[PDB]
């Protein structure tokens, strides 16, 4: 940290990492909730919260937190698991 | 961004440029895509020559000229052709042809005899 703009970048990078970490952890928690629900085997709850988790995946990819293709992969795996079970 | 640039050539005192198409991130003497023309500012009419067809293609694709390249393009009328304000006007001032060696030969023969 010798030059001015790069110090400012240190600060902004820390802020951005905090925000992205929060979003990623929220997505992770929702995915785990679905995974537990489906492994338990309640198709109703699985669908009602799969809709929610899919919205979260898309609107997390919309903020640039994760890549659109990764969001698509995750939705695909989620829906395939529910449909199969 | 893909841009139209100039690259230095020639010796120490006299620069001689190639009108070039390259990426903005490349170095000045770096790798090129297409050699489109040339520019010798070290001459009295400042020789300029350019491939009109390739210039028009690259401009249509989205290339961005640098300031000297834009000045050259305006001189040779290809910028004016691309946009359409006056039309393709040739403002080029061609090198004045030099009298032929054989013609001076015969004139000297006549004068001395």
């Amino acid at each position: 940290a010798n030059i001015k703009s790069q110090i400012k970048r240190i600060r902004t990078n820390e802020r951005r990492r905090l925000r992205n970490q929060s979003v990623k952890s929220s997505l992770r928690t929702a995915i785990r909730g679905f995974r537990e629900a489906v492994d338990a085997g309640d198709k109703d709850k699985a669908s009602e919260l799969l809709h929610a988790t899919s919205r979260k995946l898309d609107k997390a990819a919309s903020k640039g937190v994760i890549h659109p293709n990764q969001a698509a992969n995750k939705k695909s795996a989620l829906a395939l698991a529910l449909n199969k079970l | 961004a893909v841009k139209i640039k100039l690259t230095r050539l020639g010796k120490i005192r006299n620069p001689q440029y190639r009108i070039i198409v390259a990426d903005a991130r490349t170095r000045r003497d770096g790798r090129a895509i297409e050699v489109i023309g040339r520019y010798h500012p070290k001459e009295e009419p400042s020789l300029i020559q350019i491939d009109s067809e390739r210039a028009q293609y690259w401009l249509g694709v989205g290339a961005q000229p640098t300031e000297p390249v834009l000045a050259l393009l305006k001189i040779t009328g290809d910028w004016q052709k691309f946009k359409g304000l006056p039309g393709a006007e040739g403002t080029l001032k061609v090198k004045e042809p030099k009298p032929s060696k054989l013609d001076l030969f015969n004139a000297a023969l006549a004068e001395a005899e």
Partner: protein, 200 residues
Amino acid sequence: ARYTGPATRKSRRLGVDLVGGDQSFEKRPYPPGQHGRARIKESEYRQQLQEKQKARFSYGVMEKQFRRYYEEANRQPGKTGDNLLRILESRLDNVVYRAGLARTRRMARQLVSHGHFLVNGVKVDIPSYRVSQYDIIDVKEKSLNTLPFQIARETAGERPIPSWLQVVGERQRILVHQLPERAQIDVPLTEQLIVELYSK
């Protein structure tokens, strides 16, 4: 760099008169030195070497320059000896000497070096300039009236000029048609030995 030492000395050693009209060569035809009278064993390297010495010491060129000229001529499509002689005869100093304005090659060298000449309107003061086809060589005004140049130009009844050179006006104008061929160089000595030496 030029060579300043005595000239009849090298003609003495090399067995051929170079300037042409001196008396020292005739009154002393043998090679110089204490042991210039000694009988000398023959050698093909001696022959080929002395041949180059005659060529270079007649024209004034140095070894590096002459080697570069030889490489150029060997690169040329013609016979190497012919290309050699025509290249060394394309020099401005040689052309000036051949047109008669210089009583000798040293005269031509100095008179070109001090910028008394001009080819196609540009002040050329370098002796190793190579004259091309269709060149017009004139003199400048300051040198036109100077006493030695005037003497040489007014008394110029010596050795005839060749075909490709032509002096045409009383202002001492030079005009050239073509690069000479082996008949028109007509300098002494031989080219095959010159070529073989550098082929060694």
